[PDB]
Amino acid sequence: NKFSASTVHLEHITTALSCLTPFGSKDDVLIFIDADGLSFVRENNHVIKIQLLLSRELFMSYSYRNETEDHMKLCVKINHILDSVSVMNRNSDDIVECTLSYDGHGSPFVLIFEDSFISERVEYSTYLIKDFDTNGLELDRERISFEAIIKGEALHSALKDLKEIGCKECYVYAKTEANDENVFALISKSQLGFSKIKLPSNRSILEKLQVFDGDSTTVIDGFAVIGFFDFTSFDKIRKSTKIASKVLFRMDVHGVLSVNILSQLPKDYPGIVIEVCMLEKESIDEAAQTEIELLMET
Amino acid sequence: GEQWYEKFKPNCLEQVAIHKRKLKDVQEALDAMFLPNAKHRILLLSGPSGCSKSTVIKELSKILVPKYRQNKVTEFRGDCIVNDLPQMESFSEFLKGARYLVMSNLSLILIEDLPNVFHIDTRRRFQQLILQWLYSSEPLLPPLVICITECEIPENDNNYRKFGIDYTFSAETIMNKEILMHPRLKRIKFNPINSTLLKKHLKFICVQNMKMLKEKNKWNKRQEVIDYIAQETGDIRSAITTLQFWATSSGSLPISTRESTISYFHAIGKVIHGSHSTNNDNEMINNLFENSNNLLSKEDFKLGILENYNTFNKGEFSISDASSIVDCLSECDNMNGLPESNEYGLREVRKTFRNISKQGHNHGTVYFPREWKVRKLQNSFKVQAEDWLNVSLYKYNAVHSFRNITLEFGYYAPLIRKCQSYKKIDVVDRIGGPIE
């Protein structure tokens, strides 16, 4: 066909696909197929967007005979691939071999699974592409207000605690002090009241926290970055943080947050680059930020 | 700095705004259920809001409980979310813990805030637990008092499958027929507070607030306010609230009180005989439709009109008017429940009964429609015909339709089986009984 990709590491593809389940599990997933690899871009209510990245080195075979077009966009229902790739790859003597292919427009997306003596085949008929631009839910490369690198385990524990305490709303703090002290907390408004989860300033958890002046170059100390995010969208990164070693956090002055999941099988492939862009709430209230500041003071 | 209905609450039983006969009946009942082996186990109190249904119990307890208690009340709190307690077992746990309130810890259990009986799954649990209490084999149980406020549930859902609980919040839509007719359940229904106790207990509050009412020169138009409030409402709480809102005011704001919901038979009487206040039938119909749409826009109302239009003159009116009523009621049935159908079928009847309205007419007593009995007899006939068809196809070999059964084999076959078999297990009598 016009594109073909096979692999045996079904656990990796299953983990990548399970990170798209937090975004519904009963809608459409849009797939890019280019020479670099194949990705799953998923958006909910135009307020949050998640994008996978399965490199070509991840699969043992990646041909991509589509010389005419640089990339191929197809839209299919997400639940079926989630149910299909969950083979768990048991009976290690006979490894279940994956086979992904797509002949082009009108052709269905094929998922052939080979169990040596068994060759099953699933065909997913593609849907018409909705008129939405994935470039809208993207962050600046020149207006970064703050950039933080946080380890996966501490962040995952923080989101788990926030989910357990309800957390109908969430806030983000990012203040850098001139004495090399860096503070980063996830303040939340829940049934309990006002709760704060301060990340430690050690380099084992907060590798690097840099607060900018909206230019992504200046390092201003003593200033605070406030992001008011709905925890409904912020909880979508919890499952993505369960497989990550380090998480990159970047926000700009236009109220978009980019959660960059860095996941660390072949040797050449880097990993699954999972990017979860998120929009900030308007925060019509003005005393709420003052209360956030006062709580962070004492 | 407090609401006047909380700072002027009755301290004794003689300050409670309740009729003397009602108070005496409640006294006798409550003193009956505090005896060792009481015939009545649960006391149900129905009525509108603010009829002192809980203002008489909480002051009868202070004089009755510390008389039989070997040496106040235990209200159930709905908003109590215990950890490890599903929201359907809260009342069950309350009942289990309230059965130990016997001598040396005696207390009368009052259930004013009922559980969420608007959900179909916990209303059944409520009824089952109350039935277990009423059929309890425990020889010794504390008295139980349940106060249910009769209020009309406003129209919020969009479905014609609305049940009884989605129309009226009464003791019939929460308690089944078995609990209400249980021998050990005494039901003392309440009435709205009359214009005499309401006129006295408000003048009490006025003469206590003498200073404030005199400073704002609100002591020459006092009785014109208490009389208007008493004539408007039968509520002991809303009257005091309106009195406080008027006395604390410093202007000419027209006072207002909560509106009352016209009942089913009340609305039927309003349609048939007319209202005593408004002589304009258009205004009365418009206000009835804008205040009681949940009752007018039904089928039971149009059935009650047909069942009770003969009570205007005890049947002593012209047949040409009866025809003009029934033909409009039949034309309304073909309008498929449009809002223009009820507004025509309630206006034509009112106009017909107004054009023949003369004094000296001795009217009759209205009654509920009898279609509910007709449907039950029809269901009995359905079951009997099903049994006839079943016995006619296993003891024999013959298939016959239901319509043929009701027309010919519901009468002729019983006679044949009475002569062919009985004269010289089976069905021998007429299906669903004779035609009387």
Binding site: - | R77, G97, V102, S104
Partner: protein, 287 residues
């Protein structure tokens, strides 16, 4: 005004299972702070069962009380906090260890309104993550029970291991009556359920009885200074609090019971090195 810390795993465990039980007895947990101990208690809505836990000053590594800086003079400060909100704070997260559980309240003029009438709980994990919570509290008036000296009257002392196993075997969904039948010879505990009959003998509620007889050899100390009936869920929960703290130095694992007649309430009290536990439960007066 008050600051207490917990820096032991078993102490945190018993504190969580101590509060979890007080939250499942009543929606809101009332805590009184004294100069010598911390008292957390919960009363039923029917006022039929009460459980009171008393974490001594030695139970906390740091214990500071400054009542001079609501307050009831008998200087005792009592406040009411939501049980569900408190039990979701003291829970042990999976994968991380609480290196310090700090409970404090500073009600001064200088403290901000963001902390005024707001209980301060600071949790430090083994991953150095600082999680601070501010649940609201309502100052109330503490009312002590004399039952402790009223009938501190036959006394029963039995090890809680076998009784805990028996109570965990029983379920509160269908059974909520406990018969503690004790004589001088043996001791038998049966979790039974009465069967009410409908209109025509119809089984409205079925009867289930699981009986467990305990020989006096397993019994530690009994003195008839007797059939008593009470509930099951409160007794079950109160039984599961002492085992939570795995202590081998004291080696108690036992319960102390006191009751006089079917009318008077029964007192069950468990003992821990830094924790005092008691359960008040009313009894069926049907003689």
């Amino acid at each position: 005004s008050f600051k207490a810390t917990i820096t032991e795993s078993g102490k945190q465990n018993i504190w969580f299972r101590a509060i979890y039980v007080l939250s499942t007895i009543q929606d809101d947990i009332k805590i009184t702070v004294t100069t010598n101990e911390l008292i957390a208690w919960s009363m039923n809505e029917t006022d039929t069962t009460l459980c009171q836990v008393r974490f001594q000053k030695s139970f906390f590594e740091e214990y500071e009380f400054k009542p001079h800086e609501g307050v009831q003079v008998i200087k005792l400060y009592s406040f009411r906090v939501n049980g569900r909100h408190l039990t979701t704070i003291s829970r042990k997260p999976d994968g991380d260890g609480i290196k310090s559980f700090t409970i404090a309240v500073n009600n001064t003029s200088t403290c901000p309104e963001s902390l005024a009438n707001r209980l301060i709980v600071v949790i430090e994990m083994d991953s150095l993550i600082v999680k601070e919570y501010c649940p609201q509290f309502q100052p109330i008036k503490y009312d002590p029970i004399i039952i402790n000296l009223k009938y501190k009257i036959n006394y029963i002392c039995c090890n809680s291991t076998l009784l805990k196993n028996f109570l965990d075997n029983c379920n509160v969904n269908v059974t909520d009556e406990v018969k503690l039948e004790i004589n001088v010879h043996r001791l038998s505990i049966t979790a039974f359920t009465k069967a009410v009959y409908g209109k025509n003998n119809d089984l409205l509620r079925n009867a289930l009885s699981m009986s467990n007889t305990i020989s006096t050899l397993d019994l530690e100390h009994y003195c008839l200074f007797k059939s008593i009936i009470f509930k099951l869920k409160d007794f079950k929960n109160f039984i599961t609090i002492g085992p939570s703290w795995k202590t081998t130095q004291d080696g108690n694992d036992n319960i102390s019971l006191w009751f006089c007649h079917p009318g008077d309430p029964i007192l069950m009290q468990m003992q821990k090195p830094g924790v005092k536990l008691e359960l008040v439960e009313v009894t069926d007066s049907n003689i």
